Amino acid sequence: AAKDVKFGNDARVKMLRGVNVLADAVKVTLGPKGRNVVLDKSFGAPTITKDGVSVAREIELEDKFENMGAQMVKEVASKANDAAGDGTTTATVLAQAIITEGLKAVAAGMNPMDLKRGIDKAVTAAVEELKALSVPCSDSKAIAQVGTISANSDETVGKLIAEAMDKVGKEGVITVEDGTGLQDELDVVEGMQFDRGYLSPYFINKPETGAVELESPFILLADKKISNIREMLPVLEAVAKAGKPLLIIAEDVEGEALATLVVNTMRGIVKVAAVKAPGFGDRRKAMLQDIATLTGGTVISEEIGMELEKATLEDLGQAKRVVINKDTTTIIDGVGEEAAIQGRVAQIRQQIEEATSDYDREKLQERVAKLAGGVAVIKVGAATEVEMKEKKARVEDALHATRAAVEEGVVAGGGVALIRVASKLADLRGQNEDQNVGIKVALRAMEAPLRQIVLNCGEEPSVVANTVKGGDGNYGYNAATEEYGNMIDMGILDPTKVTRSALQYAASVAGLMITTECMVTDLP
Amino acid sequence: AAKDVKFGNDARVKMLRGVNVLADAVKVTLGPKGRNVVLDKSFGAPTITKDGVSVAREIELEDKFENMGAQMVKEVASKANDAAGDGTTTATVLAQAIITEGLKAVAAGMNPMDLKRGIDKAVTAAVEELKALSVPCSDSKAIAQVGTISANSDETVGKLIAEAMDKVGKEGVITVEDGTGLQDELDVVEGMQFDRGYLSPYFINKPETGAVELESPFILLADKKISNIREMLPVLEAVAKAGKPLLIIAEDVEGEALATLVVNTMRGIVKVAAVKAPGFGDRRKAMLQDIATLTGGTVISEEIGMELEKATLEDLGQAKRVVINKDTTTIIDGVGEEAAIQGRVAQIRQQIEEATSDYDREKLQERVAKLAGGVAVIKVGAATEVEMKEKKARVEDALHATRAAVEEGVVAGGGVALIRVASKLADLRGQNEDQNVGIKVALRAMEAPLRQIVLNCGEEPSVVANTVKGGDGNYGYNAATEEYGNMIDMGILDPTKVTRSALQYAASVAGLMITTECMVTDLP
Amino acid sequence: AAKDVKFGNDARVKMLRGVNVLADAVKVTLGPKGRNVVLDKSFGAPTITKDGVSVAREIELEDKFENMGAQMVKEVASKANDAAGDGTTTATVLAQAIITEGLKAVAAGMNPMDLKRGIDKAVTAAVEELKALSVPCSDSKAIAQVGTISANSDETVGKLIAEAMDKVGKEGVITVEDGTGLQDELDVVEGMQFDRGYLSPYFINKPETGAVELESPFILLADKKISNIREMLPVLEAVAKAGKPLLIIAEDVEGEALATLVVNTMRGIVKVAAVKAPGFGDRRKAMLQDIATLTGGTVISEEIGMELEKATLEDLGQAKRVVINKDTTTIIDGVGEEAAIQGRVAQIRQQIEEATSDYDREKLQERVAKLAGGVAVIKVGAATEVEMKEKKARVEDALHATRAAVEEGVVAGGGVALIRVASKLADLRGQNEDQNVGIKVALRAMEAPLRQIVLNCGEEPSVVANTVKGGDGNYGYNAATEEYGNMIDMGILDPTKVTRSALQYAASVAGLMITTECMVTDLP
Ligand SMILES: Nc1ncnc2c1ncn2[C@@H]1O[C@H](COP(=O)(O)OP(=O)(O)O)[C@@H](O)[C@H]1O
Ligand SMILES: Nc1ncnc2c1ncn2[C@@H]1O[C@H](COP(=O)(O)OP(=O)(O)O)[C@@H](O)[C@H]1O
Ligand SMILES: Nc1ncnc2c1ncn2[C@@H]1O[C@H](COP(=O)(O)OP(=O)(O)O)[C@@H](O)[C@H]1O
Ligand SMILES: [Mg+2]
Ligand SMILES: [Mg+2]
Ligand SMILES: [Mg+2]
């Protein structure tokens, strides 16, 4: 409707207060002793979470100027989650520290643009320092420790995650689903498998649940559905002559083909079962080539140079056996050459490094894992539905944290790494005095994540910080055991990527935020 | 609806206040030390920008009379942006200065219409003076300096821009896109390239990512899509006889043609890949003639005296090789005569000098750059999305500023050129005394852009101006280094076109603005 | 629904105040020193104008009784604009003067109807006096002076207008459009030209921009579109036999005819280009005969006794050459007899004196100018859109003023003519005393336009008027030079038609308005 305009200090104060509301809610969930935050949903049962990004999204303020401040700080928490999926609560804390000190500096009469220059320069230097401190994470023990720390110090989570990564490999795919029982369960899938059931329920080779096992079967792939387009008899009889079972993958199969097929399988003429292709025209067609090559078969290009009849038994691929159920199809092992398997994988490398990243790489990797690696699913056990999402959420954070730790390495936890690097940068200077103050402000803000953890434990945050600063290297305070020692030796690890990202995202938004002279928003 | 009307001073005061609100928000973003303004969007996250035109657009006032004043001053900032895309904040300042002094003169009991004439006459003389001061900008260093100054004194921006203009040439096309990394990147395209990928993924000549390389290929252009429109075999056969690869450009190619084509390419009969034309029929058809002429080929006029089959292999154009991927088609070098290349370019000159200007010239120039010059794309690197728009926006201003500086020349920055010209015009007189005062008022307003920069630096605006006036030529104060010297030697440059345009747009609206006796608006 | 009613003095007072509000806004824009009025639009940006009629339209009052008075006075300004397009502000002033004095007489206890008769009788006598004072405006200098005076003393406007009328002639057509630059530009069209481009882009005779020049072409006119309607070969070949270019005018031409036509032209068999007729069926059909007769050709009546094939080469019209572009078609000179040209013009005289007048005459004259005279278009230069409408609006008023001055002559400006005629009518008497007072009141009101001009100049209106009355003939006060002299010799002219119309429209509504005894309106 009609706008409201605020200038200078009045606008900054409202912005800050809004930021404080967002940050105060987020801070309580930081650390081993962190406390849960409950979000109200009209959708159904209210949510209880310790995840800072989840809390940031739900916070909106009635005061438009305060709300604007909160909305801008919201992004840093959201970006951290996007970059690594962990460290979001810590990133918000840094934004709080930087903003509060920065605004205070602005009040002092210092130029905001220069203060931003100081902060950014300090950030660039701090990032390089983090890289030097970062050490490779490769062994199972280190991987388990990062998972355990991410999941609010839950040993079972780290243990299970480490086993998963070990078993599936570097390019394996790991996901998490709600478990049927209280106990946490790990499921590992071997071979080539997809989520498609069988069109003909009637043909079950032996096990119940609709499990079809074909021994030494031939595999058929096609680009069209079959109704009265039954004609394929010379292909079918060729298989009948062989006396071997047939597996069919295509857009669809209709009852006319299925009806004759069922009698043929029961009578003993041929043992044949069929299943639908993966899903969408481009989606299913793309995944057909790998199935055929893996089994040594040839895909029938209805669209291109091939016809339904036009195909020889030799075209069909070979596999040891397959498993089929109402919702899933599995192939134990297609027989094909490694050079062909690797060649399929080699062409995937361009696919792997793609501009799109999100929703590109994720599906793409899954094909890759199926082609030569393995797929792992983790089940989460909880007595109640609300307990279940909290438990599962933390597990995902640990899952993402391990992925980040492996690729970029790890640094000491408890916020020790940021405070330790700050001492190193104590001699860093900018173009002018305002920049020097901005640099100093950023270093000052680095300390805050460490002290929030201590604050949440009900202990003097400044006191612990002074003792930690006094020490050297990886020395720090363990909130869980309320004592000082080597953070790395205690199993407390922070992946380098999340630590780096938290600092950079917090600083980027904070630098711009502190420079705001005037704000424009709608009237109440 | 019911109307509210104000007469004389009451209407002017309300108008002035509206103007002041709009201008005050705009002023803080002027200079090396300028401060950012944050605009609230319901659309998504809030926007932070130093661009005055962006800020002017978003300002609306609750008071209808004040709002009307702001809306009228909004146009000067917007028109300046349309003219050259830079100096919008500076133009707003001049409007502020002129209006405030002009209204004061009106209060004094002076006829407003005469004051407007005085201002306009002074402006006309000032413009001529600017032209005399303006010197040609031809070297890379000068171009870089204007880009660097435009982009809030960022040396890298000016450097990257200058390299681009040098590489592409005078008629080359330069654009800016968001970069994947944190580093600014420059991309240069050589030869003829377009944004359409290949219909047949199946034929890849060698490199991965769908890259197709045809060696000494023949190029075919058509005005019709092909389904069962397979016929053209004798043209195809002729190419097969030749033993050379074929490139196809048309509205579309269907699977039937693609199907036979894929097998033919695989068996080695012919190596042929097809790519879709540019897009819109008036669009792609227009761009077809140049492709053909460049490669020495003939476009097939399905519409006119030509037929699908009717065409000899000789009709087809030739090129060294082409590069094709999923979303892009490139031709290394078609072999055609310069007279044909230039002739296509010569006919473009009418196209260049077009009344529409906006949109018509932009697409048109892009064809031109591809035909004989080069095309450059600049990527912008930033830690966050909000940082990215700010960073990218400034780069565009510098890009536009360089374009303006090359064509109309440059003048000394820091507002020195307007203040320096004002001293020259101190002896300018109008028809009567009221006009003389109007002239004097305009000269007085010229000083303001200089002093706003100083004001934003926390220094006495009048003090710096007095010393600057005392000097001669290009002598002035450098806000960034807080010292006095030759503005041109330092590297602070203002394109003549933006300087001229800012002054003229500000004055045009302001003269009308100060002559308002009565205002009419809807009730609150 | 329910209404509020008022009687006598209470109703008249409310009416008067409404009138005063409307008139006060209008008065400030009267004279060389007149001040601008700004109107708020929800359409887009606000409008700034000195045109009284524009201001009157936008004024509406919250008080229903006051609003009713304003609505009635609005019409006089609007009717004056319709009659001549100028003097609307002056007419409103007369209504103000007459109404205020008339109401005062009603207050005195005199019959209003008699006052009306007195006013009307004085008006009738005043009109006759104006006719006697009116002298013919025939020279370029007098025309320029009226244009310049109308355009708020802008010499360039009068100069450009006079040149336009001189060049085009008495029956020529002059229009005004927004210019492409900051300078006023005049465009004159010689010969026969229309706003239709070519259907076949392919045939361009020589100059770039789609320009087609046919040398000694034959012109063909038709009543239907051509698709498969290609047949007309013997007509076409007859031209081919001749070896001359062909110009085609019809409802439409389709690609079948155009495709063959392009190839025939390309090899030099025939040089033929085709364009579309003027517009709507009746519109294009009406203007076809003149084109044919002008070029000596015959129109093909598909509708009547003629057929597509049925037409000889001799039936085709002949012209020296034609010019064609994408949006326009021009013929240098068709060869036809003057008696036929004049005969076409002679039949137009019935068309010229038409009851419809508005729209009918405007389009009709344009045909007339094209047939034997010329067409002129004036472009208006400005830096901003708002500046552009004000500048253009005044130019149109001057254009209308010159048109009015030529046909009915001119009288001395500055309001001298009305005040001078009033002295003459000082001895005029009615049937009774109340009528005598009404007459005297009207004469009294005549003085007001003169004094508003002086009032707007900040000088004693009564003092100037007393000296003006004291003088003889064309003696008067020049507001622009602040001195007394002969108004005609100083170049200040008022077209007789606007002066007469202003007085008559003002008085007609005012006479009825002063006689109102009771008003009825809706409740607040
Ligand atoms: N038991 C612990 N002792 C010391 N530090 C811990 C302990 N548990 C977690 N931390 C640290 O505190 C940080 C915040 O924990 P977390 O809730 O996971 O926040 P994120 O959600 O990671 O901001 C960790 O990244 C880690 O370095
Ligand atoms: N460091 C500087 N010292 C002196 N003058 C400067 C400096 N930097 C920029 N300027 C000048 O002040 C003007 C305003 O800067 P800018 O923010 O780009 O505003 P526009 O957006 O150009 O109004 C410039 O066009 C230039 O002439
Ligand atoms: N410079 C001048 N000196 C004296 N009288 C003038 C001058 N300019 C215009 N006038 C007169 O005052 C009248 C009003 O001017 P104008 O603004 O054009 O009103 P209209 O809009 O014509 O009522 C004119 O018609 C003319 O007679
Ligand atoms: Mg965590
Ligand atoms: Mg700029
Ligand atoms: Mg006028």
Short mmCIF file of C-alpha atoms and ligand atoms in Angstrom, two decimals, chain C residues 86-87 149-151 397, ligand 6:
data_model
loop_
_atom_site.label_atom_id
_atom_site.label_comp_id
_atom_site.label_asym_id
_atom_site.label_seq_id
_atom_site.Cartn_x
_atom_site.Cartn_y
_atom_site.Cartn_z
CA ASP C 86 -7.68 28.08 -28.54
CA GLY C 87 -8.78 30.87 -26.16
CA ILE C 149 1.34 34.41 -29.81
CA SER C 150 -0.68 31.19 -29.35
CA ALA C 151 2.48 29.24 -28.50
CA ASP C 397 -3.14 25.31 -30.42
MG MG D 6 -3.38 30.01 -26.55
#
